[PDB]
């Protein structure tokens, strides 16, 4: 199946619905009023590297001073890819904001420092392939029992607060995923 048809679940964190240049519908945030804090602070800033019709995705966020996450129902077995979108709209030095990302307890991104990787007010995406088959989740070579729901967690450490800007899951493999342009 082609791209928009292959997307099973997608969220614009801290914001309203938005359809991107690829036809992907990022839904209004289901955690509004529930857990964490929404911020539109980035709406004052141009976002580098992102396509300009879609910068609203990176200008809105959900963050928190304690660990928080999203629960995702997955109906059918198959191969999937999770895409996580971020931007640093406040700090402009390394080791100011740093956090881990976990999937059903497995640490899939260790010590994420958005500024260190891309700079200030600039798009950064993480791309995480996975498989759900024979009652198991498989990610980065580790395997555990899958019950029907995936728990995506952003973990509080010592350096400022965990955050996320947007996220989506598509059926397919990594070669099917649109990539951001190369960046120094
Ligand atoms: O709202 C502006 C900023 O407030 C806090 O510093 C948050 O930890 C940060 O993620 C956010 O970008």
Structure description:
This protein is mostly beta strands and 184 residues long. The protein has a single domain (3-176), classed as Jelly Rolls, CATH 2.60.120. The chain contains three helices and 15 strands. It has helices at 3-6, 56-59, 114-118, and strands at 7-12, 18-19, 25-28, 37-39, 61-63, 68-73, 78-86, 99-103, 106-112, 124-133, 136-139, 142-145, 149-155, 163-164, 166-171. Strands 2-3-1-15-7-10-11-12 form an eight-stranded mixed beta sheet. Strands 6-13-8-9 form a four-stranded antiparallel beta sheet, with no helix packed on it. The protein has a three-stranded antiparallel beta sheet with strand order 4-5-14. The protein is globular and about 45 Å long. The structure holds alpha-D-glucopyranose. Alpha-D-glucopyranose binds at residues 39, 41, 61, 63, 89-90, 160-161, 163. It is classed as sugar binding protein.
Secondary structure elements and pairings:
Elements lengths: L2 H4 E6 L5 E2 L5 E4 L8 E3 L16 H4 L1 E3 L4 E6 L4 E9 L12 E5 L2 E7 L1 H5 L5 E10 L2 E4 L2 E4 L3 E7 L7 E2 L1 E6 L13
Parallel strand pairs: 1-3
Antiparallel strand pairs: 1-15, 2-3, 4-5, 5-14, 6-13, 7-10, 7-15, 8-9, 8-13, 10-11, 11-12
The structure holds alpha-D-glucopyranose.
PDB class: sugar binding protein
Keywords: Qulity, ER, N-glycosylation
Assembly: monomeric
């Amino acid at each position: 199946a082609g791209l928009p048809e292959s997307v099973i679940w997608a969220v614009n964190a801290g914001g309203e619905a938005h359809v991107d240049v690829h036809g992907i519908h990022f839904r209004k945030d289901p955690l509004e009023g529930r857990v964490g804090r929404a911020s539109d602070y980035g709406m004052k800033l141009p976002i580098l590297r992102s396509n300009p019709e879609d910068q609203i995705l990176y200008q809105t966020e959900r963050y928190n001073e304690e660990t928080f996450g999203y629960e995702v129902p997955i109906k059918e077995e198959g191969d999937y890819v999770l895409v996580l979108k971020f931007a640093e709209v406040y700090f402009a030095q390394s080791q100011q904001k740093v956090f881990d990302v976990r999937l059903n307890g497995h640490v899939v991104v260790k010590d994420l420092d958005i500024f260190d990787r891309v700079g200030h007010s600039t798009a950064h995406d993480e791309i995480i392939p996975m498989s759900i088959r024979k009652g198991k989740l498989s990610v980065q070579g580790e395997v555990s029992t899958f019950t029907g729901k995936l728990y995506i967690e952003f973990v509080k450490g010592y350096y400022d607060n965990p955050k996320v800007c947007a996220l989506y899951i598509m059926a397919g493999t990594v070669d099917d995923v649109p990539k951001l342009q190369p960046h120094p």
